[model samples]
Target: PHMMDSRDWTQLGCVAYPSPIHPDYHAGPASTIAFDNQDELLWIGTQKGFAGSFIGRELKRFTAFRIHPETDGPLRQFLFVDKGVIFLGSRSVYMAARSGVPIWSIRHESMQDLRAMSFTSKGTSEILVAGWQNKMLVIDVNKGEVVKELPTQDQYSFLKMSRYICAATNKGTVNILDPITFTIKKQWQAHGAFINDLDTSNDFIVTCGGSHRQTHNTPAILDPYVKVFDLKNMSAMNPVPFAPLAAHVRMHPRMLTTAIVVNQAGQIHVTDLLNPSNSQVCYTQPQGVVLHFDVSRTGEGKALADNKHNTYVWGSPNKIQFTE
Candidate 1:
């Protein structure tokens, strides 16, 4: 793989959410953005229960589908498995092919407000879904049914690692649990307030969160740096500094020692995990606060969604390829 900062990126394409249910009405803000497993397609989920895909270096719209009713609210998150793409709604989980064809959709009684999901010990073949509900439903993604349910406390975010399942609580603590039994093997406070985002690589776990500024009445402030910890030894490491504030962070899929950090203002940094001071900086152009960011598996393509109801893609058009 090439260096993370080697490419010059520009806006390849942009799209506003469309109202498929009511054509006359303007669409809502995009809730999430992602790249397909092959990195050939960019998928966007909307606030109005729709999923759409754009393809190629220029990013032309290929297809779209209505996964849930408009009343189900925004699509919370998405998981791409070998069978297809699985996404979450308020009370249901829907699976669809890359061509926008529906495979299976399931709803469980325990799925009161589905939020976060992660592949279990079985990897893509099985997954765990949780929300404000008391129990988390374990589903077999290929079979598209709830296999089991386990009592769970509220978890706001999740990341499946090689050894432990990193589950972030609403109160800024991360619970490291067993991959099979789901027991809390370890727990640590990573932030003072809400955890903005976190990602784990082979040997390190990275996190960013909010800090209470002066007093209880003041609004929680987003920290200006990202924290790192050694996953193997359970020790805190040096923090990677970011200007303004760090809102989102993702470990480079192929380049495990590199990280991508972005702020609400559209500033992006590709920083080295081993030497944080040696970094590359760029911008996603103008307009709108970025709400979501994702990098392709190959690290050649990047996607961003903003509150302005627009999705922007960045990459080197001349040399970009999704696969190695």
Candidate 2:
């Protein structure tokens, strides 16, 4: 939005490109996209599961096709699990290979009933997929059956840690769930309003979002009062309030004190958790709303942003890693 290079994020030697994939049938927007670091493959899920992946820059379209003919919906989340990928949409969650091929898929109780999810296997093929719906379910990725289900107080978000499994519930509380038998080890209220997002890093955990008055009563996201829970004292710190709330947020890999907040207005702010005054706008989209953005492992992987369409300023997708 500015002529100055200092404020122009698009000027960072970024090459803009059209959507690598889009809806030709009825004009549907890109649902979700992923840039996996493990293999450095970038994917975008769209119409009829119109997903595509590009490697070695040059933006050469590598894979593009319907993951499955039955796969029809907005793809909301794309997660990596042991060399395979899982597509989590509002009503559908399915496992797929990198070729836009479906391995297995499941339906949620409601639209987006499947919230936070992850697998337990790292170096193994036997994977366990668990999520909240006021009901906890552990599904076999290869078999597509509920291994176990547990009743709960409310809708929950899960975090799969190296040692512990954590759950953040809609009833304004957080709990540590036993990965084996599924038991509540510790539980406590975390917010006055419903919790929108729960994230942990370094030694601190952050919980954010607010009331349904501003939020959809049906259970969606975005809000204010980002609270930090310091593990040292097991106490909650003061909150940073956002009246309009954020559409999305992310934390720096090893630095819990820094965060990336994206507002509905398409403005991206890099906030200093300790020094609010040092917070600054890092990027701003000129047009279409930003569906999401991702980072590389931590060396300032911020510019990998995308809009409602496939408009992405590429630094990696446009360059070839290997040359003749």
Candidate 3:
């Protein structure tokens, strides 16, 4: 892969909170953004609700309950399974199609806050993996039932892979577990501060911290270093430093490189970790604090990026869909 200092980034547009529900409200800032398989439609899950794209320049906005009228609560996370199906995890779990039609909805009694979700392709079955405040839930998408529940002690943040799942806590510890049975496989004390976000693919795991140290005397400064680990060997890789603190990391379709999006200070760092001794930064941009970042299945050059900055370099565009 080629490394570039800067690239052409366009400020797409912002999606404001729809009327009535949030009549006097504007866009309440964004939390995370994801792209469907095609990279044509962009999904922006905000603090308020679900707001995103439809056809063209105009931005379409709607809430989770809008599709499933019986369901209640704001959407905290959104995952695109494919072109027609989207998984929404919030106070509860629900699924919607690309046409904005609700397909299925499930409510969990122990579900406090669904922070993150991942889908795993096991044979012909698709398993829905979700991270709660202190537990991880795996639901069979085809059956719509809780397949497994793994306790994370008190940990919150988590990310998943095809074979394993990992979660981080405020105590700076990471617990790697079996995705099917929810059994603890191994535990590692990986960070100095609260773990904010993580991403894993192939055999590599990367995590970001919220603070520089354990103490909470001062405001949480985004830790600029990302810890990469070799999951298969259970060994730690050297920390890769970027100019800004990363909020989220996503592996590119090729799995050889990963993109790190800064949470507080808007910046994007694309790193190729195949050659750990020669790790390289592909791209960096000061767009503002990136709330969420994801790549398209097609490739990195056609990936999507979004931020929570009130003001951006190209002005406040709601979300950006990259194209070649």
Candidate 4:
């Protein structure tokens, strides 16, 4: 087990793995990471255009799949929705098996700059949802058809979940939509600056936003904050002020009341949504930018940023799992 800090940040000792599956298989940097139910498999999506998995006790060797080699769009986001079925979105969207085989794919001129992918509950079926540069796509995954395309004016950095699917817009607005209908359910002004990433649980929706020196003015960059909202009422819970550049927020599955946030500098913090005073420092990676982070279902597994040589600029510890 790892050490837990006052802020509730837990640090599991790091482990390294070396593999030869892709001799030229550079340990590409990952933008999103997830683990299976048993905590025995790790799935990672990289900026280098592929999704890979690590199994058993093997350390560096990862089995990877390159969905589109020519475009170089890089697999930017991934989610393991169900056993043996992994959903991935890059410059395009695709569905692949756990063993690294593409089962279905969608390529359209409109999907040029895809940002995030998720799923929504239909009456008796599940629909696949995707947020793109200028529009949102809702498709029936079972039938493989585009059900609707809702157009938008603002660009989006990513998409997340709350009571509905929320698009983290570049203009600092979170547009909530009905996952099944792709209708604009509600819109909230989340931050003064651009919204980077967000996450949610049954009770609350937490979003982290910051101003980027390269994109906005200094005032926005100086005022970064993590906003927590009540998922039931869609109203502000208490807002916690922090330095700008905080990027990711994830909810602990078992302890749904607790959440974690990772900043650009790789610092991790934990807090309780029901009670804001319970915030504390959980862990910090002194090395690279913690672009993304994930917690396992068992609440006992963690993965971190491992950018020692820049060989995998966007890569980190390929994968990690936890067992009961």
**Which candidate has the highest TM-score of all?**
1
Error of 1 at 285 (Å): 2.3
* 56 Cα displacement, candidate 2 (Å): 6.7
For lDDT, the strongest prediction is 1
Per-model TM values vs. the true structure: 0.89, 0.69, 0.74, 0.79
Candidate 1 — which pairs collide?
none
lDDT of each: 0.76, 0.54, 0.55, 0.58
lDDT (Cα, tens digit) per residue for candidate 2, span 39-82: 55566666455556655333346666655343455444566755
**How should the candidates be ordered by TM-score, best one leading?**
1, 4, 3, 2
- For candidate 2, which ten residues in a row score worst on lDDT? 315-324
Clashes of each: 0, 1, 4, 12
Can you tell me which runs of candidate 1 are displaced by over 4 Å?
1-7, 19-27, 212-220
What lDDT, from 0 to 1, does candidate 2 have? 0.54
In candidate 2, the residue pairs with backbone N, CA or C atoms under 3 Å apart (3 or more residues apart, or in different chains) clash, namely 90-112
Reference-based TM-score, model 3: 0.74
Indicate the worst ten consecutive residues by lDDT in candidate 1. Answer: 18-27
Instruction: Give candidate 1's whole-model lDDT.
Output: 0.76
How do the residues 1-324 of candidate 4 rate in per-residue lDDT, one tens digit apiece? 133543333343433221234322365455466665553666655555665666533323356766665354556666555434445454566666677665677665577677776666552234444455677666666655566776777667666554676666766777776766666777888777666667776677778775553435444352355787776787776776555345667787778788876676666566676665677554565465555566666555555544431112111233434544
lDDT of 3 by residue, 140-222 (tens): 77676777666656555555654576656556677776656556678777677677677777677888775565356766556
lDDT score for candidate 3 against the true structure: 0.55
Q: What ranking emerges by lDDT with the best candidate at the front?
A: 1, 4, 3, 2
